[PDB]
């Protein structure tokens, strides 16, 4: 089971679980309009969705959850997860968001003003990871943490099983924390640097939550989808 | 620079000394929060000026931090107040609400409750608490300064440096309470992850103000700037 993994076995499992990078619908009309871009982002996200489920089911400890909790965690975290993907992808492309390898946009290219604030936010984050020289093995830990953390406070409670599930999530989070710290020691950071890096990394998740909330906000503000329903996800979950 | 030299114990002591008082609700739900919020904000600005590192920022930077953190700061105070009242939110000593007295915003109410209860199972400590509060003041708005000029870059480093001193401070508090090296970093992580949840609740909150046509209760950049300058 998942709580038994060493830190080395946790990084390995997480690396192996990695989803693939997808391409954007090939050769769209350029220049873009506001909706054409959104049609492209939306299409891409939907296609990534399928793969994130495959990825989520291989996150040590995810499967031990009832289906209901697996869905609720994904519901809450999916955009955050895409967004950290993006920001990772974009690190060595100052000024640009690499949504797909055939879809690399600067702040002017794509066609709203609330959108450009998010874009700006994604760019900032990406620089920050670049500044911190974020490592791949750290990124997979962070992405996993996002998955297990984002929706855990809103399980709601009561029943003993509801408490068990929350307690299990929290224990997996702890091993991921042990894993991050292990990577940091391994790399030769002092304890003090280790603690500090861990904090700096985790604080960034709060910004990623914020951006997701902003993004979700916008998504709900179109008369179109375009946001995976509970049943959609449940289904996608049964093997 | 001052702030960067503090010890873990001096940092905590500065932070406890700076705590706002707990105010009473003076005397519709939106009515009561607005009355309370408005009075609390005055105190929050004076608390903020006392957070080590914070006055070393430019006034425009102080304002942006506050503008970004204000609801999360209210909210976290609320969760800490309610910690010892499971099932209830202690808005004020004379305004302690249960889930059922909770029109819209029962979602936010529930989340608030869940956070409080998370606090309670964690045995969250007053000293840890004040450290998290400060972390939020300095973290929530730092990624959106605007870099550009040399100053804005110097301001960002300085914030990150203070944040690191709050990190050392939390760890010190845990090492001193007896936690093992392992338990220290797991607890530091559990603490900070909760902050994502607070951000989340704050955003839902704002969302809810705008759909209540209550956009007005928000402190504006200029409102904030005038209060700081006093
Ligand atoms: C241009 C802006 C402000 C984007 C925010 N955003 N980002 C992605 C996304 C899709 C795939 C991916 O891998 C990573 C992503 O971040 C995305 C997908 C749908 C809607 C939005 C939104 F929120 F803008 F409406 C999205
Ligand atoms: C100005 C307004 C109404 C903000 C909205 N607000 N304010 C507080 C809050 C206020 C003061 C305080 O001491 C503690 C609090 O938690 C609060 C708590 C729960 C939900 C909301 C909601 F949904 F309106 F955003 C809240």
Curated annotation (Swiss-Prot), chain B:
Q: Mind telling me what this protein is named? A: Estrogen receptor
Q: Which family does it belong to?
A: Belongs to the nuclear hormone receptor family. NR3 subfamily.
Assembly and interaction partners: Binds DNA as a homodimer. Can form a heterodimer with ESR2. Interacts with FOXC2, MAP1S, SLC30A9, UBE1C and NCOA3 coactivator. Interacts with PELP1, the interaction is enhanced by 17-beta-estradiol, the interaction increases ESR1 transcriptional activity. Interacts with EP300; the interaction is estrogen-dependent and enhanced by CITED1. Interacts with CITED1; the interaction is estrogen-dependent. Interacts with NCOA5 and NCOA6 coactivators. Interacts with NCOA7; the interaction is a ligand-inducible. Interacts with PHB2, and UBE1C. Interacts with AKAP13. Interacts with CUEDC2.
Tissue localization of expression is: Widely expressed. Not expressed in the pituitary gland.
NR LBD domain location: 7-230
- Please give the range of the full-length protein represented by this chain: 305 to 546 of 595
Please tell me the species this chain comes from: Homo sapiens
Q: Can you locate the S-palmitoyl cysteine lipid attachment residues?
A: 131
How is this chain modified after translation? Phosphorylated by cyclin A/CDK2 and CK1. Phosphorylation probably enhances transcriptional activity. Self-association induces phosphorylation. Phosphorylated by LMTK3 in vitro.
Q: What else is known?
A: Selective estrogen receptor modulators (SERMs), such as tamoxifen, raloxifene, toremifene, lasofoxifene, clomifene, femarelle and ormeloxifene, have tissue selective agonistic and antagonistic effects on the estrogen receptor (ER). They interfere with the ER association with coactivators or corepressors, mainly involving the AF-2 domain.
Please tell me the disease that this Swiss-Prot or TrEMBL record associates with the protein.
Estrogen resistance: A disorder characterized by partial or complete resistance to estrogens, in the presence of elevated estrogen serum levels. Clinical features include absence of the pubertal growth spurt, delayed bone maturation, unfused epiphyses, reduced bone mineral density, osteoporosis, continued growth into adulthood and very tall adult stature. Glucose intolerance, hyperinsulinemia and lipid abnormalities may also be present.
Query: What does the comment on domains in this protein's record state?
Result: Composed of three domains: a modulating N-terminal domain, a DNA-binding domain and a C-terminal ligand-binding domain. The modulating domain, also known as A/B or AF-1 domain has a ligand-independent transactivation function. The C-terminus contains a ligand-dependent transactivation domain, also known as E/F or AF-2 domain which overlaps with the ligand binding domain. AF-1 and AF-2 activate transcription independently and synergistically and act in a promoter- and cell-specific manner. AF-1 seems to provide the major transactivation function in differentiated cells.
Q: Where is this region: Interaction with AKAP13?
A: 1-230
Please give the residue positions where the record annotates the modification Phosphotyrosine: 221
Give me the ranges of the annotated region Self-association: 1-230
Q: Where in the cell is it found?
A: Nucleus; Golgi apparatus; Cell membrane
Region: Transactivation AF-2; residue ranges are: 7-230
> Reported effect of changing residue 81 to H?
In ESTRR; highly decreased estrogen receptor activity
This protein's source sits in the domain of life called: Eukaryota
Q: Which cysteines are joined by disulfide bonds?
A: none
Q: What does this protein do?
A: Nuclear hormone receptor. The steroid hormones and their receptors are involved in the regulation of eukaryotic gene expression and affect cellular proliferation and differentiation in target tissues. Ligand-dependent nuclear transactivation involves either direct homodimer binding to a palindromic estrogen response element (ERE) sequence or association with other DNA-binding transcription factors, such as AP-1/c-Jun, c-Fos, ATF-2, Sp1 and Sp3, to mediate ERE-independent signaling.
